[PDB]
From a paper:
AtaT is a type-II toxin from enterohemorrhagic E. coli, reported to acetylate the aminoacyl-moiety of initiator Met-tRNAfMet, thus inhibiting translation initiation. Thus, AtaT has broader specificity toward aminoacyl-tRNAs, and the selection of substrate aminoacyl-tRNAs is governed by both the specific sequence in the acceptor stem and the side chain of the aminoacyl-moiety of aminoacyl-tRNAs.
To uncover the molecular basis of Met-tRNAfMet recognition by AtaT, AtaT, and acetyl–Met–tRNAfMet (Ac–Met–tRNAfMet) were co-crystallized and the structure was determined. The structure was model-built and refined to an R factor of 28.6% (Rfree = 34.1%) at 3.8 Å resolution. In the structure of AtaT complexed with Ac–Met–tRNAfMet, two tRNAfMet molecules (tRNAfMeta and tRNAfMetb) interact with an AtaT homodimer (AtaTa and AtaTb). The 3′-terminal single-stranded region and acceptor stem of each tRNAfMet interact with the positively charged interface between the two subunits of the AtaT dimer. In the complex structure, the α3 in AtaTb penetrates the major groove of the acceptor helix of tRNAfMeta, and the α1 in AtaTa also penetrates the groove from another angle. Residues S76, K77, S78, and K79 in α3 of AtaTb interact with the phosphate backbones of C67C68C69, at the bottom half of the acceptor helix. The 3′-C75A76–Ac–Met region of Ac–Met–tRNAfMet was disordered and not visible in the present structure.
Residue numbers in the entry:
A (entry chain G), B (entry chain G): 5 to 172
The structure:
RNA sequence: CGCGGGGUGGAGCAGCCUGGUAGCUCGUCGGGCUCAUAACCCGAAGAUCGUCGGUUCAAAUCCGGCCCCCGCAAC
RNA sequence: CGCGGGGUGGAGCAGCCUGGUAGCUCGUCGGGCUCAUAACCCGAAGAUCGUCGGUUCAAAUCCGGCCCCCGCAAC
């Protein structure tokens, strides 16, 4: 099952290793208080085992971006404010032992489900992500992430309405 | 009871009248698609009557602000990003017939409860509000809203931890 | 769904209304005729009709979802 | 809770460790003495110990939550 971090963590963190080093450091170093200080929410894809074998995680932090980053002025005439409510997908990683099996997209989908249940609360438009990787940018575009073109040139977006349609 | 807008609205909107005109226009004019386009979420304080007597409402839109707006550099050393996850309390109003009875604060508290349940999802820090009214700024400071001093000089803030402590 | 219009060679228009059919003016190029040409005559290429779906033996055409562009009232 | 220090007249320090007590140097001002003064002698004011709580007959002092400030490693 997929689950958020409990109050008592009791996770095994060192034997985990995703692809990129920077994300390993983000896991080992910055995540603890950022979760406890309610900077972001971390969701964990684990085996539900006693060892809590760590194989995936993702981070969600609400955010804003310049409205001009939208590609279509038609969508701009729909939003009456200079800033756009967004949720930044801060980081997303799966252990290397499972890469090439689509669990990346499964995590993105669970995150979209959570963002949908959240849209019931503060009604933001979808998922913002600033993908440094080129593979990540193309991988997101494969799932249909809208490229945001503005002062930022590396972000991809996913609308709330597409999330509604995905869950029928 | 307090409730969000259903799919079928069936509300009585004209006989409602809050204090400020601008908010009346925001209600009559911009709210419909902003709810339907998932720009924000509107919560309604109604009598649960057949007429759906409208006496209060508030709007929530996730947002960001410059980190330098925080008053204490101590809290700045806690947040490792230039932008801070926030939820903007876009608008808040109660019908004039009930002003001076504290339902303003009751709505703020229900909104805080919702932001708490949301903090379980994207872990933002609390409530951002840009209060044009001076009465509103002082009224928020009475409930303990932290004034944000930065490029913006009119916003007030409420942390997530205070919300946790309020609900015991 | 704020009101309304619109989607097609490279550009700009008609083809609908009325299901079966790719048309017109520029532009490109080829050819013919001229001392010669952006001028005159002839010819060729490029759009599969914004995308997706439905009905139909068949769809640019009728119907629905969505996308995009333009003007205006509001921000 | 990244590591560590710190909170007190207007500024900078000690008072803890050891519960009962407001102290020192500047600064302000008043007075005395000088041709006179920031110089010498005397005196006064201003902090209720960051905030909140707990224990105690009693708290700056012990204990807890929180707030704020400084340095450094990281961003």
């Amino acid at each position: 099952t997929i689950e958020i971090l409990t109050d008592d963590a009791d996770y095994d963190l060192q034997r985990f290793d995703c692809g990129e080093e920077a994300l390993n450091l983000f896991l080992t170093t910055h995540l603890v208080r950022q979760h406890r200080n309610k900077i972001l929410r971390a969701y964990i894809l684990c085996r539900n085992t006693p060892e809590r074998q760590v194989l995936g995680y993702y981070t969600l932090c609400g955010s804003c971006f310049e409205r001009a980053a939208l590609p279509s002025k038609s969508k701009q005439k729909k939003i009456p404010y200079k800033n756009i409510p967004s949720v930044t997908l801060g980081r997303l990683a799966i252990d290397r032992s499972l890469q090439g099996q689509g669990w990346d997209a499964t995590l993105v989908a669970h995150a979209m489900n959570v963002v949908w249940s959240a849209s019931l609360a503060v009604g933001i438009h979808g998922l913002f992500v600033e993908a440094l990787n080129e593979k990540a940018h193309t991988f997101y575009k494969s799932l249909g992430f809208i490229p945001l073109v503005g002062e930022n040139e590396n972000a991809l977006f996913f609308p709330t309405k597409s999330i509604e349609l995905l869950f029928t």
